[PDB]
Amino acid sequence: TCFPSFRVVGEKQLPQEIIFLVWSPKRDLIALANTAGEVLLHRLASFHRVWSFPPNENTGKEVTCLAWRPDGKLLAFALADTKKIVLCDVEKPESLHSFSVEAPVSCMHWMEVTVESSVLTSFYEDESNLLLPKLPTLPKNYSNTSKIFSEENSDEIIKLLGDVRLNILVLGGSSGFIELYAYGMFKIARVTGIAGTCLALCLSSDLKSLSVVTEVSTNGASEVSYFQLETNLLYSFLPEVTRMARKFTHISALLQYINLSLTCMCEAWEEILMQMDSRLKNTTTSVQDEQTLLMNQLTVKGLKKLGQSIESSYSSIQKLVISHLQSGSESLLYHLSELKGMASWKQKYEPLGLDAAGIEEAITAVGSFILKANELLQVIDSSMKNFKAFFRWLYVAMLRMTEITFVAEFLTEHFNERVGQYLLHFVKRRMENIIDQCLQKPADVIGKSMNQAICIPLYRDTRSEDSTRRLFKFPFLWNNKTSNLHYLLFTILEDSLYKMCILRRHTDISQSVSNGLIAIKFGSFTYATTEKVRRSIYSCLDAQFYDDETVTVVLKDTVGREGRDRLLVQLPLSLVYNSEDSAEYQFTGTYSTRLDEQCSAIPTRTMHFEKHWRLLESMKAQYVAGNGFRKVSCVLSSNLRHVRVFEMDIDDEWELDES
16 A cells, blocks of 8 residues: 655645745745835745735835845845845744845845854954944834834844844845945955856855856857856955954944934924024014013913923933934944954955045044034034023013013024034044945955856757746755865756756865766656556656755656646655765766767766656646755746745655556
8 A cells, every 4th residue: 555755734826926935954944025115024834925016106116036044044035126125034024124225136045154154353342243233222212224223222132133144145136246234233355257047046154155057148048057167265364254244234334323313303303493483563663572362372371381391302312312322433442443453464354345545534433523513512512502591581471561682692592593504514424434435345346256167068059038037046056065066957948858867066166076967867766665667758847855874856857747747756866866886977078078968978867766756647747846854845836926845855655556
């Protein structure tokens, strides 16, 4: 009695086509974006929807990619229409952080450096290590995009983002370039000369190399090619870069905070002035001061109790300047000074782009901002002494209405828009200008440090010209963090069947590795209990790495057409790279020309499967989502609306039929 080799824990027919999908790294959750541009998160068990993240003003309405952090504690997605990018908390469908990028994003890969690396020589103090500022929280609940400063007194957002080892979120697209975002926050490189559209991005665990798969178009067809770029600065100076990305993010977060604080005083003071002013009898004069039903609504009580309204407003704005803005300015100068102590060590730090000079200038501009702020505080004192001058002599005039130099102040005030202007002002703009060039230089230096490349072209054909959404799942890139390699999975079409190939290179660019190229023909499918054997002609509809040693595959039987025609197959690498006859599967050609142009050169291993595979039952299946950790997986269909979720460690409870 026979059980086909996987067990199905859930099946749904989704209301919207699924445009992209990815499993969590550590958990039984899966993430999907549909064509409504909403991001769905689902549980394994009976493919239950955990939450929906629909679009709005700060999202886009069109999402291209999704990337989990290696934690799985943070999901990221890309908005193509509004050209921005969101960092989603897992436990709730809200934007934990977000930022714009220049042009649309077609690919993302979010990496993290080894634990062995995280270890810290201590050049720093509780504040210096910390990634983000925590300062008195901002009364405006409009945080705009990212709620960090606005959310009240939660360390947790900051701890979640920054209390972790260096992690880098790599971005790619058709725009001509690739960016690298430390911590998922600050941009520490931009690489150019990237031709066409990015299909796939993989940055190494050890930061020795970045691999790229890219599609270019001679207008009849398209060519797809693999690239391995060298990231040498990232390797040799890890720790300086991690330290300087920590201080750089922090600094940019301050810039944001002192912006918001400044915004904050301005809107509050604006609205109190408005509500006061137009609250406001035929006789012409503005200055009556030297209308008695002045006193039949607003009274000797009313005067006092407009009074506290206003000195309180004023108190909000000083307290705001000192406690919020000035102390942000202060922290700025502490990280600045530490940064100049970095750039003091000439040889260590600046192959990475910190001018001692630029930092020095930034610091002087900050000082001028603090000082222009201290200068602002007594524009406030004097405005106050006038207003409350006015108030007090007026009070007496109101109860003298029953039974000096700042009388001139009273007149001046009535003529008064005096606080309006005082807040040339924007030193803000110029401070953040100088700082912004300091921050933006390392990005460019490093991106220019990645100029070396390997090129292996893969194939040129019309396969993608027929337009239904491609999902950018394939071809596929995998880093093997234990054996330190790059795997690329791709298909090339021969007999008008797609033949599956596995390419692999050493993470270090100057060194080679066994069996760089090998293809796969699938010979026989059978089980150990039924000795019916399936031997047919199969084409490869998809593939994705399950774990370090295994690859999930989806095949189309060429000959089975209605519902009985597609197969799900686990492929063990230990038998592809099998120690004995691995020597007689060897590439006979050259990487100097395309791979698809020489087929008879590429070694094919005929492999006969008796375990770990299933015919898919009236399924229609096209694409696969592997999870090797939590040992589940998931299969999406031709119509992008139909999913089938398997526990992959278990046989089905359901016995099998065959004719």
